[PDB]
Amino acid sequence: PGSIPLIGERFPEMEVTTDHGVIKLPDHYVSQGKWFVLFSHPADFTPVSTTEFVSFARRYEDFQRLGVDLIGLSVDSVASHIKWKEWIERHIGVRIPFPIIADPQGTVARRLGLLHAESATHTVRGVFIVDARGVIRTMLYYPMELGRLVDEILRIVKALKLGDSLKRAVPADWPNNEIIGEGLIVPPPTTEDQARARMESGQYRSLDWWFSWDTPASRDDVEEARRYLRRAAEKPAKLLYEEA
Amino acid sequence: PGSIPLIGERFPEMEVTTDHGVIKLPDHYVSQGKWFVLFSHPADFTPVSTTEFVSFARRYEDFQRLGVDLIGLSVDSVASHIKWKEWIERHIGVRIPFPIIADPQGTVARRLGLLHAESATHTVRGVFIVDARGVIRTMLYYPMELGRLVDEILRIVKALKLGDSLKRAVPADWPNNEIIGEGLIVPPPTTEDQARARMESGQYRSLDWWFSWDTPASRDDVEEARRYLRRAAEKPAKLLYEEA
Amino acid sequence: PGSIPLIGERFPEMEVTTDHGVIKLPDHYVSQGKWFVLFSHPADFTPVSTTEFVSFARRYEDFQRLGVDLIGLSVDSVASHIKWKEWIERHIGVRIPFPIIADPQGTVARRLGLLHAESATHTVRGVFIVDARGVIRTMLYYPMELGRLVDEILRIVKALKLGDSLKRAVPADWPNNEIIGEGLIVPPPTTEDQARARMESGQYRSLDWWFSWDTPASRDDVEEARRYLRRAAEKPAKLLYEEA
Amino acid sequence: PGSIPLIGERFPEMEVTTDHGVIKLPDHYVSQGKWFVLFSHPADFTPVSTTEFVSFARRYEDFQRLGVDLIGLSVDSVASHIKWKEWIERHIGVRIPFPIIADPQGTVARRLGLLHAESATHTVRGVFIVDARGVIRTMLYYPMELGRLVDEILRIVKALKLGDSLKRAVPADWPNNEIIGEGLIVPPPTTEDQARARMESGQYRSLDWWFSWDTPASRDDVEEARRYLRRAAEKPAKLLYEEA
Amino acid sequence: PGSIPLIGERFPEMEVTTDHGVIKLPDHYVSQGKWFVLFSHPADFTPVSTTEFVSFARRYEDFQRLGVDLIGLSVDSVASHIKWKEWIERHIGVRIPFPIIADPQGTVARRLGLLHAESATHTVRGVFIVDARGVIRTMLYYPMELGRLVDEILRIVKALKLGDSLKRAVPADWPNNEIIGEGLIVPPPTTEDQARARMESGQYRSLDWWFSWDTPASRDDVEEARRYLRRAAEKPAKLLYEEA
Amino acid sequence: PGSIPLIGERFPEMEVTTDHGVIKLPDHYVSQGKWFVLFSHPADFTPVSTTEFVSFARRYEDFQRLGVDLIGLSVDSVASHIKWKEWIERHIGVRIPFPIIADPQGTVARRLGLLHAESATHTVRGVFIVDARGVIRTMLYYPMELGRLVDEILRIVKALKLGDSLKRAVPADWPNNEIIGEGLIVPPPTTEDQARARMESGQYRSLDWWFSWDTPASRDDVEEARRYLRRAAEKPAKLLYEEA
Amino acid sequence: PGSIPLIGERFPEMEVTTDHGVIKLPDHYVSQGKWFVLFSHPADFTPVSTTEFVSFARRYEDFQRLGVDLIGLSVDSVASHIKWKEWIERHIGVRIPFPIIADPQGTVARRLGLLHAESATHTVRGVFIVDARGVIRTMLYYPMELGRLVDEILRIVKALKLGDSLKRAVPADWPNNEIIGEGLIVPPPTTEDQARARMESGQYRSLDWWFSWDTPASRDDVEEARRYLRRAAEKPAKLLYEEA
Amino acid sequence: PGSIPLIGERFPEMEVTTDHGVIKLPDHYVSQGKWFVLFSHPADFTPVSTTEFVSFARRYEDFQRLGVDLIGLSVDSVASHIKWKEWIERHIGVRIPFPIIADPQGTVARRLGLLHAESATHTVRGVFIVDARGVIRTMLYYPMELGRLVDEILRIVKALKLGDSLKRAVPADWPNNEIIGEGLIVPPPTTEDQARARMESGQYRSLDWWFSWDTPASRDDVEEARRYLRRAAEKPAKLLYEEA
């Protein structure tokens, strides 16, 4: 009972107003050869949303390294965005370096299907992962009551970029897959002839003609991907509330 | 674009055929007081899909301890589902204990908006997290080329059940939030009088009238959630490909 | 209350995916000067469907003598086609040399009217006999519970090619017709002048101006068509289940 | 294309005029506990159609023994039907005992989808096999130029009646299937529990959990069916044209 | 409650199949400088229809002398047309020289409004008199139960051609009109001035300015028309059933 | 084209104004159990129309002997009808005893399809022969330029009433049919059993099972019909224009 | 209600048939510089209508002197018009010199809105006063039971023509207006500046800035207008019925 | 263009505001057994409209003698109506006793078809003469530039009232008709029988069966109607502008 963009579709053409200026999506990021993560939050001056902005902000360098820009979205106006980012910097001591789209008539929210039954007026916690051709690669929709795991967004972009560069599919829980560990999967044969040639070539470890894998990711790519999940699993060293 | 069910809507009433029999969604799970994760995969005898079924099966008791049932979906017929599950048990040594929906005309797929531009004929890797009242709580759309992180699905269900039980919102990266750690958020005041009373009462740690939290989750609640993320982060000691 | 292509119509233009690759119908066969028989079955790993695939396979050389190619169709995906053909070769000892169309959204099933009331999701046992101009010559619709008589499909193609080459119509039960045996029927006069000319010429055996025939089929043609029927009538020497 | 009735549908309700009187289909046969074969031919005083009427008449007692009534169909009027059947009895020495529907405006032809691209005005050679509950079980569409094999129509009815009676599916080319001969197939299991139970039980010969069979058809049932096919295969002893 | 062509309209353009070949109406007759009488009959091998075909055949030479051709029409096929005309030649001793249209799907009948409430499936006894410009000049609709008076069709054609060449209207019962006998009527004045000039001229016998006549038809034209009516009135010298 | 009522339909329910008063058709004549002939003419004070009114008036006793009432129709008003009937009585010496419908807006004309392409404003010379049940039995459409043969209207009513009262069909040109003279046709058999019973019986003179006749009409019936045609064929003894 | 043309619109473009010929309105009069009065009457040989035609005829030269032509209209045909005009000349001794439109399908009547609730089939007594540019200037609708005052139609046309020529409005009851007698009204000022200038100029007799008049109509124009009204008021010396 | 109500229709039901208050039409007058004349004028403070109001007011007692009330209409509001009537009494010396409808949005004007092409904003000079049953009897449409002849409106009511009470039609120019003078016309016969009875009764003076009259109006009634026309034709004794 609501309409969304689809994986494999170009991100919808739109002019949006941010607290950094007016930009065209997705062209502004395509032009720079950058991926972007567009994520939404119900409203400014809400606590879960503030935790999520701080989490994105502390991982900013990790996104920069992957060649990924971040852009937020809520139904609030630019002035609230500026006051809210100023509060976070002053009260939590973390600067929010990325822009937030101001969507007061919910024009962007409706276009991206971010108004769910949980609220008629405020956007759910949507995530659009968009590559440097402007194509939607992955979408997540978290609810109002539950913050995102930002390290999984890093792992998705890392794995997707590795998949594209090595021409491989990525197993469940990569790089900690229980069957093939850090293995990456060769796209299966699509014909009788290709299945026979694959089962005869010896080129790849195989469980069957449709299930072949090798280990072409560098130790560095594998350990970078693992470090995202290690950070997600670590009890924080010192809580930001104690000095605030 | 394309049309989906939404967060906060009841899962659409539908009768589906599984390799376990015919069932009505969501009633089959609601009538048992169980949550269910419905997840889709493009086709049987595909390699990423196999790794994901084995990750789900490995985490099956973790799901059951939460009162969460699993149910798969592809456009394959039940005979293929039975052959594929027999192949996994025989070649990987892992029984798939949960059912798979057979959706040969894409009826269920079209209803849950699981056909994206990547494939006209096979579902993407959708995830629907549905509570024991039959309400959609969270939705994930992974693409063909990228397997899911199943421990994030366990983290979502655990955190949602804690939120429901303790009347709290869950911060980013819980239970390892950089600001408040394993802290849970008190839903913010919605009026001037509630805001004033909150800032006067001294009942909760606060950064402002709209950002209050406490630590009401049991040690075992927190450790269960940390265990899911530690498993996501750890390289497995034994790869299952090496058993065959 | 369902729609079909019709005898005398060109086979609908369509791209289909098979376990041999992607082909245009009917162009792929028209370009080789070949007839094709497109037949459908409900699902892979079904027993009647297996018997019919083995029946087609054993008669493969008979279809190649007539210049006919075979092409199957079900709603199953390519991977299941490949595992099912592998299963037939391994357990029955019979190679299936011809392709199977994979039709998971029933796009082809709906174009050809192969979804009947017996199943909303699986095709009935359709047979389209298509000549080397890509024209539909004969259509059969067998149900789920009843396998085809493949020797009748051979007799239909042989008789059609014979009618086409000799400019003749083919009587009931040819070449064992009770009135004229292996005789072929001259197309009847369509005018008073033609009717009178026919009745006066004595060129043909006649029962009346509208019922004339001769015996222009070679003894090879007659005996090859009769051999199809003798094979259909004979108790097999040895059942394939015995050596398997 | 053009619309047709479908396998598993009730034969469309209709009153028809035949050279025996006015009847309601399918009720006239359902109320007698009888199956019927409705078949069509392009026009009266056509030679292929004449050969088929004589083939049906010769097999009339075989159809009566199965509890099957025959009813023909063309766009001609009753008076042509009567003159043509008199011509057949007088000139071929064969009485046509069964009625022919007269369908001059093509009302019945359009309802049954019997007008194909080959003729705008005359029906092709359709066959509708309808059980004693008024349900369409099988449909054949033969073209103008090609007479039917009437013994296949007996084998279809015989096979269908055994399938219904013994709760079995019928293999390819029964009762001469190359894999199981006169064997009939047990409906395959539809669930994991049913598949495991079938393969533990040892009640039936099997090639796999989905492919079980036994030989419950009487000697008399099998010999009746082989007799239809033997007659199809054997050159007739005396041709009717001779004494004419 | 049925739609017809109209007097003064061109006969609707159409391709029809006859027992003489395929022709375009009205072009086939216009090309030859001919009028035609198209007449319909319910079905072949019907007795009133047989009496009409014999009456038309007996008057055929009279039609030809007038530059008029005859064409029949029923919902029967060409093969029935040919058998029926042969039956008439053989049993009545009268050759039917003119073609019959075969209209099995009632395309022609429906275009011409020949399907009345008396029969849903068979044409009434319609008559279309069409001149050499292909314009409909007169239309008669006789029922199933009542044969036509063919001599009145001859009188109508003769009187129209006389009216056309002589620029005259034809009185009731011409050439035996009770007021003016074989007189023909001068088209009445359409203005006061023409009325006054008519009354003043004394050029014609008149009863009033609107009722003038003269006698410009030749003795031969008048004798020809009286012959049609004397033939209609006289009991035949010998009955064709006696000679049969 | 245009629209008409049809043979076998009840005459359309309508209230009409005549120079005798306002009546319901066909109720006014049904309610007296009388047949009626409704006939149309273009306009009052037109010469052909005048000749037809005089012809109908001369035959008024013959119509009354058959229990048939006459009613005219034109687009003129009642005052013009009355002045035109007075002019006929005054100048031709013949009283018009039957009413004329006044149809100034062409309401009746459009309902009976009497406006053809010869005139957008004036009716052609339509004839509707309606029985005592209000059923249309025969329809004639003569053009502006050609007066009707009123004796053929008498022959039609006479033969229709004979057909109704004897259960017979009436051959072409009755009672001067070339094959059977004054003979009347027995409705043909409609079934195989009736056809055989008819051929075994010898109750009737027969040419075949479908062509039987007897002579059940009284001499008075036959001679009255022949009288109408003899009157049509007779040179008038004395022209009314001379008598004036 | 019903649709009418309006004062200030061009008379609807139409071709009409009269007892003088076929003409186009309003072109036929515009091309002559003529005004026309089109008037309707319910039917020919009606007494009020006859009185109006004689009244128009008696004033024909008064209309001609003003450059106004007359044209009548009824749903009668031309022959009835000619006969009715003949009757008036012969029985009343007055020639009707002007044409009457014949409108048998009420095409003109419907276009001019002349069918009111008093009669569904006959026009009321409409009057369209049309100027030499073809523009409707005035419309009167008298009922069936009331003849027009033809001298008021002369007053209207005379007054409209003086107003056009002298650029003046015509007071109530001109030329015997109780306030200003034969005075004509100056079109009132339309601005504050024009009002002041008119009150200052002393150029006209005035009651206020909006009520100014002068006496620019000739003695001859005034006496003609008074002659029309004097004639309307005068009891005729001799009645035409007594000279009949 | 432009819809109006019609002669023979009930005046449309409406609530209207006047300078005397709110009244329902036509009920307000039907209740009192009174005719009314509703008339319209373009605008208050316009010269021709002022002359008409004065003419109506001078003839007020003549209207009251006939039991006719007067009601005006313009698109002006009540205040302009009161100021304008006040101006007429003060400057011309004539009290306006009847109400004026205020129609500022042209609601009443559109309902009565009073907006013609001559002004999109101001009403033409419409007159509805409505009888005591509330039926529209006559309608006049005078233009902006031309005042009405109010004595003709008196003549119409008088003649209509006379015709109703005496059951007579009124000749042109009554009571000064040039054929029958003050005679009134008997409604013509509508049937042949009625026409003959009228022609033989000698009861009325006649010119033909359709034109009969007598002199049943009182001498008072005739002279009162003639007075109205004498007043219209009289050069006024003294002009009101001199007594300004």
The tokens of B31 are what? 């009538």
Partners of residue H139 on adjacent β-strands: G141, H128
Chains that touch C (3 or more CB pairs under 8 A): A, B, D, E
* Closest residue in chain H to residue G148, using alpha carbons only: H172
Query: Does C122 sit within 8 Å of B104, measured CB to CB?
Result: yes
Distance from CA of H205 to the nearest CA of F (A): 19
Best CA proximity match to H215, nearest among H187, H181, H188, H189:
H181
Local structure of E216: helix, strand or coil: coil
Query: Which residue in D78, D83, D85 is closest to F190 by CB distance?
Result: D78
Helix (H) / strand (E) containing D219: helix D219-233
- Chain B residues with CB inside 8 Å of C75's CB? 75, 77, 104-105
From residue A109, alpha-carbon distances to A4, A98, A138 in Å are 10, 19, 17
Query: Does F244 sit within 8 Å of E177, measured CB to CB?
Result: no
* Closest residue in chain G to residue F109, using alpha carbons only: G105
Q: Which residues of F170-182 are buried (b: 16+ CB within 10 A; e: fewer)?
A: bbbbbbbbbbbbb
Give me the total of CB pairs closer than 8 Å, taking one residue from chain A and one from chain C. 17
Handedness of CA D10, D13, D14, D18 (dihedral sign): positive
Give me the total of CB pairs closer than 8 Å, taking one residue from chain D and one from chain E. 71
Query: Does E21 sit within 8 Å of C188, measured CB to CB?
Result: no
Residue to substitute from G78, G81, G83, G101, interface E, most E β-carbons within 10 A: G78
From residue C159, alpha-carbon distances to B85, B128, C172, D150 in Å are 47, 57, 11, 15
Decide: G181 and G189 in contact? Cβ < 8 Å: no
- Chain B residues with CB inside 8 Å of A2's CB? 3-4, 6
What count of residues does chain F have?
244
* Closest residue in chain D to residue F194, using alpha carbons only: D20
Token look-up 């990266």 returns B173
Alpha-helix runs per DSSP H in B66-112: 78-92, 107-111
Region of residue D236 (phi > 0: left; psi between -120 and 50: alpha; otherwise: beta): beta
Q: Which residues of H32-61 are buried (b: 16+ CB within 10 A; e: fewer)?
A: eebbbbbbbbbbbbbbbbbbbbbbbbbbbe
Best CA proximity match to F81, nearest among G83, G17, G199:
G83
Helix (H) / strand (E) containing D192: helix D192-201
β-sheet with H184-185: strand ranges across: H184-185, H211-214, H205-208
Query: Which residue in D205, D229, D233 is closest to C241 by CB distance?
Result: D205
From residue H33, alpha-carbon distances to H16, H25, H130, H131, H137 in Å are 19, 13, 11, 9, 15
Q: How many CB atoms lie within 10 A of CB F234?
A: 15
Local structure of C123: helix, strand or coil: coil
Decide: B165 and B71 in contact? Cβ < 8 Å: no
Q: How many CB atoms lie within 10 A of CB A90?
A: 9
Say how far apart CA C170 and CA C178 lie, in whole Å: 13
The tokens of D216 are what? 């419950």
Query: Does C79 sit within 8 Å of A192, measured CB to CB?
Result: no
Query: Which residue in C147, C180, C210 is closest to D170 by CB distance?
Result: C147
Report yes or no on chains A and H touching (3+ CB pairs under 8 A). Answer: no
Distance from CA of A213 to the nearest CA of C (A): 17
The tokens of C2 are what? 């369902």
Instruction: Find all residues with CB under 8 Å of G65, minimum gap 6, and list them.
Output: G224
Say how far apart CA E68 and CA A99 lie, in whole Å: 91
* Closest residue in chain E to residue D102, using alpha carbons only: E121
Alpha-helix runs per DSSP H in chain C: 27-30, 47-58, 60-65, 78-92, 107-111, 150-166, 192-201, 219-233
Helix (H) / strand (E) containing D164: helix D150-166
Instruction: Find all residues with CB under 8 Å of H105, minimum gap 6, and list them.
Output: H75
Distance from CA of E138 to the nearest CA of G (A): 23
Region of residue B235 (phi > 0: left; psi between -120 and 50: alpha; otherwise: beta): beta
Helix (H) / strand (E) containing F150: helix F150-166
3-state secondary structure chain G: CEECCCCCCECCCEEEEECCEEEEECHHHHCCCCEEEEECCCCCCCHHHHHHHHHHHHCHHHHHHCCEEEEEEECCCHHHHHHHHHHHHHHHCCCCCCCEEECCCCHHHHHHCCCCCCCCCCCCEEEEEECCCCEEEEEEEECCCECCCHHHHHHHHHHHHHHHHHCCEECCCCCCECCCECCEECCCCCCHHHHHHHHHHCCCEEEECCEEEECCCCHHHHHHHHHHHHHHHCCCCCCCCCCC
Instruction: Return the percent helix, strand and coil in chain D, to nearest 5.
Output: 35, 25, 40
| Nearest 10 degrees: Cα torsion E26, E31, E33, E38 | -20
Helix (H) / strand (E) containing F38: strand F35-40
Helix (H) / strand (E) containing B14: strand B14-18
What homologous superfamily does CATH list for A146-244?
Answer: Antioxidant, Horf6; Chain A, domain2 (3.30.1020.10)
- Chain F residues with CB inside 8 Å of G105's CB? 75, 105-106, 115, 120-121
Phi and psi, residue C20, nearest 5°:
-115, -10
* Closest residue in chain H to residue F78, using alpha carbons only: H190
Residue F77 is classified by DSSP as -
- Chain B residues with CB inside 8 Å of A210's CB? 45-47
Instruction: Return the percent helix, strand and coil in chain B, to nearest 5.
Output: 35, 25, 40
Distance from CA of C94 to the nearest CA of D (A): 11
* Closest residue in chain H to residue F96, using alpha carbons only: H192
Report yes or no on chains D and G touching (3+ CB pairs under 8 A). Answer: no
- Chain D residues with CB inside 8 Å of F192's CB? 19-20, 82, 85
Token look-up 């309209």 returns E9
Q: Residue B223 CA to chain centroid, in angstroms? A: 19
Phi and psi, residue H108, nearest 5°:
-65, -45
* Closest residue in chain H to residue F84, using alpha carbons only: H192
Distance from CA of D23 to the nearest CA of C (A): 23
Q: Report the half-sphere exposure of F233 (CA within 13 A, side-chain side).
A: 16
Instruction: Find all residues with CB under 8 Å of C168, minimum gap 6, and list them.
Output: C162, C184, C185, C186, C187, C216
Partners of residue F101 on adjacent β-strands: F18, F73
Could you please report the per-residue DSSP string of E117-157? TT-SSS--EEEEEE-TTSBEEEEEEE-TTB---HHHHHHHH
Q: How many CB atoms lie within 10 A of CB B22?
A: 11
Query: Does G143 sit within 8 Å of H151, measured CB to CB?
Result: no
Query: Does D47 sit within 8 Å of C169, measured CB to CB?
Result: yes
CATH class entry, domain C1-145: alpha beta
Chains that touch F (3 or more CB pairs under 8 A): D, E, G, H
Give me the total of CB pairs closer than 8 Å, taking one residue from chain E and one from chain F. 278
Q: What method was applied to determine this entry? A: X-ray
- Chain D residues with CB inside 8 Å of C179's CB? 50-51, 54, 92, 239-241
Q: How many CB atoms lie within 10 A of CB H65?
A: 11
Query: Which residue in H144, H163, H177 is closest to G51 by CB distance?
Result: H177
Token look-up 């569409």 returns D141
Best CA proximity match to H233, nearest among G163, G147, G175:
G175
Report yes or no on chains C and E touching (3+ CB pairs under 8 A). Answer: yes
Query: Which residue in B104, B120, B121 is closest to C121 by CB distance?
Result: B104
Paired sense of beta strands H68-74 and H35-39, if any: parallel
The tokens of G17 are what? 């048939």
* Closest residue in chain F to residue G75, using alpha carbons only: F104
Query: Does H193 sit within 8 Å of F82, measured CB to CB?
Result: no
Report yes or no on chains F and B touching (3+ CB pairs under 8 A). Answer: no
**Strands (DSSP E) along chain D, which ranges?**
2-4, 14-18, 21-25, 35-39, 68-74, 100-102, 125-130, 136-142, 184-185, 205-208, 211-214
Q: Residue C108 CA to chain centroid, in angstroms? A: 18
Phi and psi, residue F186, nearest 5°:
-80, 130
Say how far apart CA B214 and CA H175 lie, in whole Å: 108
Write down the domain spans for chain G. Answer: 1-145, 146-244
From residue G240, alpha-carbon distances to A229, F167, H207 in Å are 120, 67, 11
* Closest residue in chain E to residue G95, using alpha carbons only: E192
- Chain D residues with CB inside 8 Å of C190's CB? none
